[PDB]
Each structure stands twice: as structure tokens, then as C-alpha cells.
């Protein structure tokens, strides 16, 4: 018969399949190996990167939520347990206008350190007291300004020089500084920094305030006069300035100076002649006394626009393409069970 | 004759493919479980983890590009819209320059300027003006130097003290501190403060400044000129101090008290006698009077060099073995094919 | 520097300085502001961009209060 | 960008006091300069007046002692006041900025941009 | 105000001149009937962001020129001179420029 040729052939397939699973064997290793890659070394990797993230995201959160008590740590600790100001870390504002409701005073005072709040914190400070645990305990001391709304002047003066027989006779004021009245008496501050202006309110230091008569405005109408003792200092040999004012300048010219008001761009505008003129903001630019030229105003200059450069996001998420994994897999999973059906036939027909 | 030992070959031949076949879709169902997973549960870690650190470096990369502004609002919050001078943030130095070259003034003023970039930073500040949406709106106020090169000279005095049968007569000089001379006049500082000494340009306050007569220098020479009165304070209990001066000091030495010069290494090295002497600050090391010991100049003390600590990468990159992954699949995939082409000849081979 | 001794006056003068005297300020203005930012909407709560944009804002408006002009 | 606009009453009875205003978006009026140019029917431009950012004032010579101007932080505005106005004050107004900038020759300043103006009419 | 006539595509040059020496601060202006002045020209040779070029600014000193290449139909307005060196701001009379 012809079954003599087909044990041959049985041996055959069958080494065949014995080399399939041997193939299928290798595959299931190459598995193995990328299973077990992907299960602990890039797990391991992805696990200590998020442990990093981890720690660089407490450092950041760490200083976004304390950055109050890290400035004022670090504003102490430049200056020493102590803060020349009222900075907004010390006191926020809400902090400060609660403050300044709940002081001694009445409401027009209230009110007006609730507009110049700046300058309160400016004439205020700040105390290092302790240390406790991870605490930093400190002391604001804020200023009370009772008065409110009194007449002030500021006095500024320049020598005045007169010449007989060639022989000079100057006579400068003492009086220069900044007077705002009070109750019972006036207070003089001989330094023109004393007192800072903002807007139209002048707040005066009280500890280099002077209490005198309120007849010191006497010396505005006559110097000469007997009700008060105005202080003058005489000279004899003539001297030459400018004595800036707030709305203008007053000029000496004596002997030989040659002095001139001008400008900055054309030049020269009119000599000036002997003795003293006053000149105002609106009438000039700078004062020139020989080779020296002093300006009257602000010398406004440039304008600058600075931005910054932008931030922009890097995120580029991932994205696996399945689809054809899915349709292979669900090739793979369908010929798998024809196969095992097909066999199952082929055994099922031996009976 | 062995058609029954054929059948039962058959039998277990067919067995052993079904059990392959069956571990073939256990493999695939595993494959399938760590598809599954590696690309859900794994991207979205790597999404998250691509989230943050883009979330880190947008924080870091504005805090590295606003630099220049949140230093300027960190200063102004310090000093409640005031900044004590013109520091590096507020105006760069090719800015400082360009303002420089653009003040009216001349080119001897402009390069003394350029050479004294610091005293003019130091002299000048800046104010707080606004702010508009994100914005930050200030003015920087620079100092114009218009006089300069100029005689300046500094006057120190100490008590000069005659005795009389016991019956002393002490002097002492009250034109003590800065002079520089002038268009007009001289301009006088009383605190020695009111001057600071760059190299050996001296650059003076103005506010502190006041305008005296040329003829003061005669005081220099005899003070008992009739052409000038010289300000001095008569005395007549003794009075003994050290008066610092720049190159040296003043000692003066009076009644029960006992005055040296010495080291700081050994003692006496000179007894010095009643009255004023003037030392150099070459001449010894030290001034001794009574228990009290004043230093003539700076004690140069210790210098320290010290280096913060280093800042290493730790980037460690990952890969995979991938010549024995391809060597695996390139067998896999012959031995396949072997499998399939040998079958085709078994098959062809049982005709 | 050259300092004398002035024995007649128990005093001393120390000469050889060049004057720097100011006569006029000059003034400049600035204004600086903050770069463009965007979203990063990938972040589930707060973001710690959004967070700093946020302190930047309450600091700016903390700032107003103490500006020049009211 | 940054622009701006007039408002005023149109009509003004003589010897009284006229009130402009002008109107800026798109910035702050501290950061630059600020300045208003009349310009009567038929005629040539006339400057009026520069202020700047600190409140300082320069005006013309020929209306210094009649105009005022002013800053204004909370409703971004500029203000114009001419006092004792007569016929010979109509004309159309414009407000516009004064830039000031490094160019290749140095420190210069000019007018950019303009408002597109309003008409201003005195009459009994 | 002093008139010129020219056609299309013709060479205009337009010329001013200042009392005294002012270097570089002149300034050029155009301004078309029912608008505001619109600038072309700031610090006598610096043509200003947005307008054509076929404007050109030079000069220095006392003597300035604008001048238009290719003129066209839009080119038609009155242009003024006005002087940066110092307040007051003064602006030149104009040159109306008109049709052929």
C-alpha cells in the first residue's frame, strides 16, 4: 500500500512542530527579558524621578508658602534684628489699616493715615525680639500723628551785600528751616530735611523739632523789629551763591563774579545785574555764577519701556498607537481557536 | 501492521500541538495584559511627571527672565516705595552711562563721572511712582557734578591748655571739619561726615554745606588776625583726648593725667610730655591715656578665603539590550518559516 | 595728601583734595513689566506657575498702596 | 498700543473758564509725556504746553498765565484749563504724546501719536 | 499758507528753514484735511515706523528738505516743520500741497 511513504512525512511534521515550539520557546524568552525590563528598571527609574519631582516640588512649595517669614527673616538678618521701614511683609496692609483704626485719635486723623498709610510705614519700623522654636517674634511701632491740617512755611535765605566807600556790609538770616505751628508755642526745624513734604501735607521728625514764640513770624515783615530778636549773622566780605528755593532760586552777585541767568539749549537769556535777584521756575532754566551753571529744575530725560522675556509650557504628552496592536492580538486570539478546532476535528476523526 | 501504533503516534502528536496552542494563548493573553498596561498605567505617570516638570521649569524660567523687576519690587516693598540709592537693578550700568553722557554739562565733568560710577550711584535714588496692571512705574534721580577738581583742605583741632600758677587757659578751634573752595566763596561742612573721601576726589553733601567768605583761610596761618574772626571757645578747666587726624592724631596731655605712645605687641614705647604733641600714624602704633588705649590705625586683622561647595549632574541616561531582542525575533521568525516551508514539503511529500 | 602741623593752634590741616560738588539732578523714568505667561492646563489643582503669578499679583497690589500718586 | 481721546463742552460763553480732558488706554500716563496743540480754522499749529510724569509744567509763552494742567492716576487722564477764554480762543484741540528716545544723534523727543482733537466754540 | 502743484509720480521738494542752527531737532509732519498731524519725520533724517519711504528727511544746521520720490493720489496734505531745540514748540507755517 502507499502508507509506506507517510511515516516519513509524519516524522516530519512533527519535527516541524517540535521547531515551532522551540520558535515559540525563544519568543516567550525575549518576553520574559522585556517583561521583566519594563517591570523593574524603567518602573525603578519613573519611581525615583517622581521621588525627585517629589522633593524639588516641597523645596518650591516650601518657599511660595512661607515667603512672609522668609523675608522677614532675611530683612532682620541684614540689618541686624532690626527693619529701618514698615515693609510690606512686616505689616500687610489690611493689618495696618485695622491698626490705625483701633489708635487714640480722632476720625480726621484717622482718615489722613489711612491716605498717607506710605508714610506711616516710612516713619515707622520694625524690632527683633526672639527667637522660639521655628518662630521669629518681632515688634512693629507704628506713628500716632495727632495734629493734623496747621499752617507751615519754610524760610530760605541768601546774603544780602551792600557796598559804600568800597567797603561790604552783609547780612544773612538764621532762621532758614521749615515752622508749622501748634498749640501753646511753634516748632522750627533749622534743617531743611527734617520735615518731608508729600503732595501738599508736610510731616515734620519731632526729634529734631524746636518749640519757639509764636512772634518768630515777625521776622517775615521786619527784621528790624523789637518784638522779637530775629537771628541775623553779619559779615564783612561779600560772598556770591544760589540759594535754591521751592518755586524758584534766589541769586547774589557781588564784586567781581560775572552771573547770568540762561538756559541748557540756546544759551545765555539775560546778566543779572549787582546784589540780590530772585528768580523763578518759570522764568529760566540754570543760573550760571562765572563758570559755574546750576539748574533750577529737574532735568527731565529719558523715558525707558523694559519687558521682560516670555514663558511658555513645554508639555508633550505621549500616545501609543493600539489599534493595530488590537487588531494583530485579536488575529492572534481568532486563529488560534481555528487551529485548536482544526485539531480538535483531526483527532476526533480517528475512531 | 502497525497502523495502530500510527494512529496512536497521531493521537499524542495532535495532543502535544493542542497544549501548544494553549500555551500560545496563555502567552498572548500575557502580552496582551502588558500592552495594556505599559500604555495606560505607565504614559499617564509619564504624563503627569512631563506635567510637573513643565509646571517646575515655567516657575524657575520666571523667576530667571522677571529677575531685573521682582528685584526692583522686592526693594521698593523693603523700603515702602523709596530706595535708599540707585542699585544695579534699578538702572544697568550702560543706562547709568548713556544719562551720564547726556547731562548738560562738560566733557571733564562727564569722564570724572564715568570714572566715579559708584559715588554717583551712592548720591543718587529712586522713587516709587505707580503701578499699572503688571507693570512697575519709578523714577531714578541722578546727582549732576558740575564743579570739580578743586582745593579742598579739613581742619582737626584739640584743646590747647597754658598754665598760670594753676590757673589754666584752654583754646580750642570750632572751624573743625571740610572746606572746598568755590565760584564766590567757600563752602564750608562742619561734620566731618558731610564729605566723603574717594581716592583724593572729596565729594560733599550740598545740604550740609554752607557759604563762607574766601578770607577764612587766614585762620590757617595766625588766628589771632584782625582781618578775619577766627571761631574759637575759650576755657578754663583742662580737657584731655586724642584727636584722630588723617595721617596721625592730636593728643594733648594736662593736671593728673598720664599720655604714651606704644604698640599693641609692647608696651611704653614713648612718654609724652604735658601739653599737645602730634604723632604720625608712623611713629607708633597706639595712643595711651590714663588706662584708656586708642588705636591709631586700622587693626588689620585676619583674611579668610572661603569657596562654597561644588554642584554635580546627576544624570544617569537608560537603554536597553537591544542586539539580543532583534537576534531573538530574527530566530523566531526563521524558525517560522522553516516550520511552514517543511510542512509544505510533508505535505507535497504525501501524494 | 599733605598734613602740617599748625603748633601755634593745636590743630592740623590736611591738604591736597579735588572737590566733587553736585549742582542739579537729572532724572530718568522706567517702567518694567511682566512677561507673557500661559496655561499649563495638564496640572490637576493648583499649579505652581499659576501659584507664582498669583503671589506676584498680591505683591503688585500691596505695592500700589505706598506709591507716589494715591 | 496707546491711544486717546478728547471730551469737552463744544461751547464756551466768554470770559468764562474751558475745561478739557483727554483720555488715554492702552498705558499709563506716567510713563511718558504728555503735551496739547490748538490749531484754529484756516491757521498753522500752536503748542500749548508739555507736562511730564513728576508734575512738572513748561507752557507757551504767549498762554502761560491762563492754562493749567494736570495728572490725573485714577481715571488715566490729562487735564486742560483755559481761563478767560474769548473769540480768538476757538479752534480745534489735540492731545498727543511727547516721546523722548535714544536716536543716532542723541537725545530727541517729538510728537506721536495725536488725538483726533475737538472742536471748540466761544460765543455770547 | 505758501502752495505747490505737482502731478502724479512727480518729484516734490519741500524746504524750510530755521532762524538759528538746531542741528538735528526738526521735525516733519503730515496732515490731511478733517485729521489730526500725523509724524513722518523725527530728528530731520529718521523716517518714522509705518510710513512709506518714499519720504526722505535731510539736512542739519539751518537748512532741512523733504522730499517725495514717486508721489501718489494719497500724498496730497499740508506738511509742517517744527523745532525740537528748545520751548516754545514752534511749527512752520505749512506747505499745502495740491493737484495739477
Known amino acids: 500500500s502507499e502508507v509506506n511513504a507517510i511515516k516519513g512525512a509524519l516524522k516530519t511534521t512533527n519535527e516541524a512542530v517540535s521547531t515551532l515550539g522551540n520558535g515559540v520557546r525563544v519568543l516567550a524568552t525575549a518576553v520574559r527579558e522585556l517583561k521583566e525590563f519594563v517591570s523593574k528598571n524603567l518602573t525603578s527609574a519613573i519611581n525615583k524621578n517622581k521621588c525627585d519631582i517629589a522633593d524639588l516640588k516641597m523645596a518650591v512649595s516650601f518657599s511660595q508658602f512661607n515667603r512672609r517669614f522668609l523675608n522677614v527673616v532675611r530683612q532682620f538678618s541684614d540689618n541686624a534684628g532690626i527693619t529701618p521701614a514698615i515693609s510690606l511683609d512686616l505689616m500687610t496692609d489690611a493689618e495696618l489699616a485695622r491698626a490705625v483704626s483701633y489708635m487714640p485719635t480722632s476720625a480726621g486723623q484717622i482718615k489722613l493715615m489711612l491716605e498717607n498709610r506710605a508714610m506711616v510705614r516710612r516713619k515707622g519700623f520694625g524690632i527683633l525680639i526672639g527667637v522660639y522654636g521655628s518662630s521669629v517674634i518681632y515688634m512693629v511701632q507704628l506713628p500716632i500723628f495727632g495734629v493734623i491740617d496747621t499752617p507751615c512755611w519754610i524760610i530760605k535765605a541768601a546774603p544780602s551785600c551792600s557796598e559804600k566807600d568800597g567797603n561790604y556790609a552783609c547780612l544773612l538770616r538764621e532762621d532758614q528751616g521749615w515752622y508749622c505751628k501748634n498749640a501753646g508755642s511753634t516748632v522750627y526745624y533749622p534743617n531743611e530735611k527734617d520735615c518731608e513734604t508729600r503732595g501738599d501735607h508736610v510731616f515734620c521728625d519731632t526729634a529734631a523739632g524746636i518749640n519757639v514764640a509764636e512772634q518768630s513770624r515777625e521776622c517775615n515783615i521786619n527784621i528790624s523789629t523789637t518784638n522779637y530778636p530775629c537771628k541775623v549773622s553779619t559779615g564783612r566780605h561779600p560772598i556770591s551763591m544760589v540759594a535754591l528755593s521751592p518755586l524758584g532760586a534766589l541769586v547774589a552777585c557781588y564784586k567781581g563774579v560775572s552771573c547770568s541767568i540762561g538756559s541748557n539749549r540756546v544759551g545765555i537769556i539775560k546778566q543779572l545785574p549787582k546784589g540780590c535777584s530772585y528768580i523763578t521756575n518759570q522764568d529760566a532754566d540754570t543760573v550760571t555764577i562765572d563758570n559755574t551753571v546750576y539748574q533750577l529744575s529737574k532735568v527731565e530725560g529719558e523715558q525707558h519701556v523694559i519687558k521682560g522675556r516670555p514663558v511658555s509650557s513645554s508639555f508633550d504628552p505621549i500616545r501609543f498607537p493600539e489599534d493595530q496592536f488590537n487588531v494583530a492580538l485579536d488575529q492572534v486570539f481568532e486563529s488560534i481557536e481555528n487551529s485548536q478546532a482544526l485539531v480538535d476535528q483531526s483527532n476526533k476523526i480517528l475512531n | 501492521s502497525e497502523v495502530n501504533a500510527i494512529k496512536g503516534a497521531l493521537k499524542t502528536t495532535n495532543e502535544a500541538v493542542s497544549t501548544l496552542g494553549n500555551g500560545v494563548r496563555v502567552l498572548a493573553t500575557a502580552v496582551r495584559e502588558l500592552k495594556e498596561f505599559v500604555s495606560k498605567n505607565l504614559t499617564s505617570a509619564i504624563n503627569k511627571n512631563k506635567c510637573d516638570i513643565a509646571d517646575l521649569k515655567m516657575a524657575v524660567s520666571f523667576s530667571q527672565f522677571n529677575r531685573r523687576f521682582l528685584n526692583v519690587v522686592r526693594q521698593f516693598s523693603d523700603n515702602a516705595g523709596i530706595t535708599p540709592a540707585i542699585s544695579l537693578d534699578l538702572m544697568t550700568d550702560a543706562e547709568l552711562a548713556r544719562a551720564v553722557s547726556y547731562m548738560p554739562t562738560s566733557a571733564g565733568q562727564i569722564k570724572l563721572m564715568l570714572e566715579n560710577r559708584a559715588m554717583v550711584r551712592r548720591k543718587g535714588f529712586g522713587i516709587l511712582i505707580g503701578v499699572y496692571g503688571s507693570s512697575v512705574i519709578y523714577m531714578v534721580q541722578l546727582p549732576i557734578f558740575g564743579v570739580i577738581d578743586t582745593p579742598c583742605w579739613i581742619i582737626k583741632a584739640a584743646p590747647s591748655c597754658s598754665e598760670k600758677d594753676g590757673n589754666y587757659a584752654c583754646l580750642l578751634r570750632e572751624d573743625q571739619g571740610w572746606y572746598c573752595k568755590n565760584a564766590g566763596s567757600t563752602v564750608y561742612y562742619p561734620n566731618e561726615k558731610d564729605c566723603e573721601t574717594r581716592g583724593d576726589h572729596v565729594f560733599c553733601d550740598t545740604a550740609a554745606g554752607i557759604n563762607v567768605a574766601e578770607q577764612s583761610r587766614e585762620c590757617n596761618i595766625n588766628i589771632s588776625t584782625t582781618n578775619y574772626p577766627c571761631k574759637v571757645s575759650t576755657g578754663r578747666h583742662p580737657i584731655s583726648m586724642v584727636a584722630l587726624s588723617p595721617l596721625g592724631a592730636l593728643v594733648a596731655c594736662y593736671k593728673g593725667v598720664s599720655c604714651s605712645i606704644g604698640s599693641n605687641r609692647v608696651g611704653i614705647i614713648k612718654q609724652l610730655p604735658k601739653g599737645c604733641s602730634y604723632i604720625t600714624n608712623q611713629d607708633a602704633d597706639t595712643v595711651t591715656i590714663d588706662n584708656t588705649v586708642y588705636q591709631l590705625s586700622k587693626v588689620e586683622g585676619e583674611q579668610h578665603v572661603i569657596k562654597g561647595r561644588p554642584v554635580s549632574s546627576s544624570f544617569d541616561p537608560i537603554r536597553f539590550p537591544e542586539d539580543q531582542f532583534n537576534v531573538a525575533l530574527d530566530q523566531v521568525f526563521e524558525s517560522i518559516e522553516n516550520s511552514q516551508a517543511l510542512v509544505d514539503q510533508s505535505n507535497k511529500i504525501l501524494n | 595728601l599733605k598734613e602740617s602741623y599748625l603748633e601755634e593752634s593745636c590743630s592740623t590741616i590736611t591738604e591736597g583734595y579735588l572737590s566733587v560738588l553736585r549742582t542739579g539732578w537729572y532724572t530718568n523714568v522706567f517702567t518694567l513689566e511682566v512677561g507673557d505667561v500661559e496655561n499649563l492646563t495638564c496640572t490637576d489643582g493648583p499649579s505652581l506657575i499659576k501659584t507664582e503669578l498669583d503671589l506676584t499679583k498680591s505683591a503688585l497690589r500691596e505695592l500700589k498702596t505706598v506709591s507716589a500718586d494715591q | 498700543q496707546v491711544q486717546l481721546q478728547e471730551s469737552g463742552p463744544g461751547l464756551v460763553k466768554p470770559s468764562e473758564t474751558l475745561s478739557l480732558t483727554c483720555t488715554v488706554s492702552?498705558?499709563?500716563?506716567?510713563?511718558?509725556?504728555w503735551s496739547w496743540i490748538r490749531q484754529p480754522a484756516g491757521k498753522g499749529l500752536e503748542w500749548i504746553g508739555r507736562?511730564?510724569?513728576?508734575?512738572?509744567?513748561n507752557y507757551n509763552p504767549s498762554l502761560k498765565s491762563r492754562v493749567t494742567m494736570s495728572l490725573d492716576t485714577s481715571k488715566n487722564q490729562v487735564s486742560l484749563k483755559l481761563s478767560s477764554v474769548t473769540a480768538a480762543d476757538t479752534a480745534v484741540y489735540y492731545c498727543?504724546?511727547?516721546?523722548?528716545?535714544?536716536?543716532?544723534?542723541?537725545?530727541?523727543?517729538?510728537?506721536?501719536?495725536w488725538g483726533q482733537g475737538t472742536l471748540v466754540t466761544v460765543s455770547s | 499758507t505758501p502752495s505747490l502743484s505737482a502731478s502724479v509720480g512727480d518729484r516734490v521738494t519741500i524746504t524750510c528753514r530755521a532762524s538759528?542752527?538746531?542741528?538735528?531737532?526738526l521735525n516733519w509732519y503730515q496732515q490731511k484735511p478733517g485729521k489730526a498731524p500725523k509724524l513722518l519725520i523725527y530728528?530731520?533724517?529718521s523716517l518714522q515706523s509705518g510710513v512709506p519711504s518714499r519720504f526722505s528727511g535731510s539736512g542739519s544746521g539751518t537748512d532741512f528738505t523733504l522730499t517725495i520720490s514717486s508721489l501718489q493720489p494719497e500724498d496730497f496734505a499740508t506738511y509742517y516743520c517744527?523745532?525740537?531745540?528748545?520751548?516754545?514748540?514752534?511749527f512752520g507755517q505749512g506747505t499745502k500741497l495740491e493737484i495739477k
Open positions: 538759528q542752527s538746531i542741528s538735528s531737532y
Open positions: 507736562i511730564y510724569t513728576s508734575g512738572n509744567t
Open positions: 530728528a530731520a533724517s
Open positions: 492702552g498705558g499709563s500716563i506716567s510713563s511718558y509725556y
Open positions: 517744527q523745532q525740537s531745540y528748545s520751548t516754545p514748540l514752534f
Open positions: 498727543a504724546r511727547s516721546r523722548v528716545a535714544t536716536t543716532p544723534v542723541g537725545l530727541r523727543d517729538w510728537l506721536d501719536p
